[PDB]
Amino acid sequence: FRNNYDGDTVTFSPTGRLFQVEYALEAIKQGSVTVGLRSNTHAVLVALKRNADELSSYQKKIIKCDEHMGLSLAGLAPDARVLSNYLRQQCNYSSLVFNRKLAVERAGHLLCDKAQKNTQSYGGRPYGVGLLIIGYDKSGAHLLEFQPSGNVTELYGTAIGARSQGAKTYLERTLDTFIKIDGNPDELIKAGVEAISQSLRDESLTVDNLSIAIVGKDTPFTIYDGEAVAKYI
Amino acid sequence: GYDRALSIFSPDGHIFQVEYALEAVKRGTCAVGVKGKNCVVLGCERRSTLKLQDTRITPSKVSKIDSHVVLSFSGLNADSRILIEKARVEAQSHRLTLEDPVTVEYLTRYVAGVQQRYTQSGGVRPFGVSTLIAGFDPRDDEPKLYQTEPSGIYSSWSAQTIGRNSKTVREFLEKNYDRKEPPATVEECVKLTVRSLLEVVQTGAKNIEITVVKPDSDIVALSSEEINQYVTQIEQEKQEQ
C-alpha cells in the first residue's frame, strides 16, 4: 500500500490521500510547541525554543512580517524563512502600491495558494512547517493557523508542535475568559504562557528558553526574548 | 532539458556515481610522478591488449596545458580530453586578464573545480578520471606536483601514483623516497620513476614513457632508447646481487 503511493506529491493513494503532504505534516508534530491566542484588542504568540546541546543557542521561532503582522513556526525552519519572506514581500507590495496595510485574512489566502502549488506539481515538495499568524488590521486582532497542506484557519486561539494537544484543550476551555482580556497585554500573555506550560513535560520554561510576541490596537508587532520575558516565568 | 540527479547520496552517506568513477580510474593505465630538487618527472605505462599502433599519431598520455605545466591521468581517455581542453582555455584566459601564466596550484584548483561541479549538477555523470599536474610557477624554481580525483578533491605530493596497481607502486615510493634528500638530479629522479614503474609494468621498454619538466618552460619527453637505457642499468642493480 502506502509505499507505492508515497513517492511524490503528484500521486493520489487509492483512498484519495496525498502521503508526501501527510509526511510533511509529521515534521510539524516533531517540532517544538508554540501557542497563539487573541482578544479583541491584542493577539499573542508564545513559543518554546529548542536547543541542540547545552552549549548551543535556542533557535528562534517567531518572525516579524510587518509592523502589524507576524508569525511563529513549528517544523522545518528554512521553509519558515521562505514563507515568512514571501509574506514580508506581500505586505510590502500592499503598502508601496496601494498605501494599504495587508489584511491578515488576505495574507492567509496568499499563503494557502503558495503552499498548494507545491502539492500538485512534479519535482517540488510540500513545505514541512506549520505557522501561526497574528496581526492587527482594519477589522481588529487576528490569529491564523497555517498547514503545509495549504489549509489556513482563523481561530481565537490554538497550538501546534509536539504535545500541542495540551495547550489546545486548555485554550478551548479558557476561551470565554481570555477572549475578553482587552486593553491588558500582560494578562493576555500570562494567559498564553499558562496555555503553553500545559504542553511541557521535559523541563520548565526558563529565561533563554521562552519567546513571546504581541501585536494590537496601539502596539506594533514586537518580540520579547530573555530578560524581557523574565517577568512572566 | 535533461537534468536528472545522477550523483546523489545513498543511506550510508556515499555518492555511488563518484565512487564508481574511481573504479574507472583503478582500471586505467598506471601513472606516476616524482619531484626532484630542481625538476618533476611524469611516467605512464602503455597497455598491450592490442599492439600494432602508430606511436607517432596516437595521443600521448602527458599533455602540456601551457609551456610550463603538464597533466597526466588515469581513467577514461575520452573524459580526459574534456578536462585538458578546459584547462588549456583557462590557462590562456588567465594570461590574458592577469598578464601572468597560471601557477600550478591555480590550474589544479581549476581542474578540480570542474570535476566537483560534475558531481552535483543535474543531467551529467562525474569524470572517470584522476590527474597529476606538474610544473613550475612563473619565475619560480621550486617543483610542483598535484593530484585531483573524480570528487574534486586535490592536494600536492612529493611523489604519487594513480591507476591500476598504483597500490603497489605507491608502496615502492613510500619506502624509496626520502623527503630529506629528494632526487637532486634529473637523472636519479628519472631513475626512481622508472624503477617504481617496473614494479608493475613487467618488462616494457616500449610500455613506459617519461617526460621531464624543468624550470622556465623546459619540457621534454624521452625516447625509447633514453628510457631503455635506464631499464638496462636498473636490471643490473638487481643481478649485481
Binding site: K64, R88, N92, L96 | -
Partner: protein, 102 residues
C-alpha cells in the same frame, strides 16, 4: 516627443552642528510659472535618525525616498534590527542612484 523629466522647483538646505544636524526645504511645488501646491513636504524622516530630501524632478525624488525607506526596513529584517549608520545610508544611496546611471 515625450520628455520623461520635469522640474518642480524647490530648494533644500543642510547644516551639520557639533552634536546635531538640520535639513530644511521650502514647501512650494511648481510647474513652469504656476504653483501646484503651497504646502507639499519635501524633507522626510526615514527612520534610524536619518532625514532625506531628493530635490529636482519630484516624481523621481519621491521614488528614491520611497525606495530608501524600504531599504532601511529590509536592513532591519536582514541584519537583526541593526541601526543603519549615516555613512552606511550614504553608500546605499550611491548604489540606488547609480543603478539608474543610464
Amino acid at each position: 516627443q515625450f520628455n520623461p523629466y520635469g522640474d518642480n522647483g524647490g530648494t533644500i538646505l543642510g547644516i551639520a552642528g557639533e552634536d546635531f544636524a538640520v535639513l530644511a526645504g521650502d514647501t512650494r511645488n511648481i510647474t513652469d510659472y504656476s504653483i501646484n501646491s503651497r504646502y507639499e513636504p519635501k524633507v522626510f524622516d526615514c527612520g534610524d535618525n536619518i532625514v532625506m530630501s531628493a530635490n529636482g524632478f519630484a516624481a523621481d525624488g519621491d521614488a528614491l525616498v520611497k525606495r530608501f525607506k524600504n531599504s532601511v526596513k529590509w536592513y532591519h529584517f536582514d541584519h537583526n534590527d541593526k541601526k543603519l549608520s549615516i555613512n552606511s545610508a550614504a553608500r546605499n544611496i550611491q548604489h540606488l542612484l547609480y543603478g539608474k546611471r543610464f
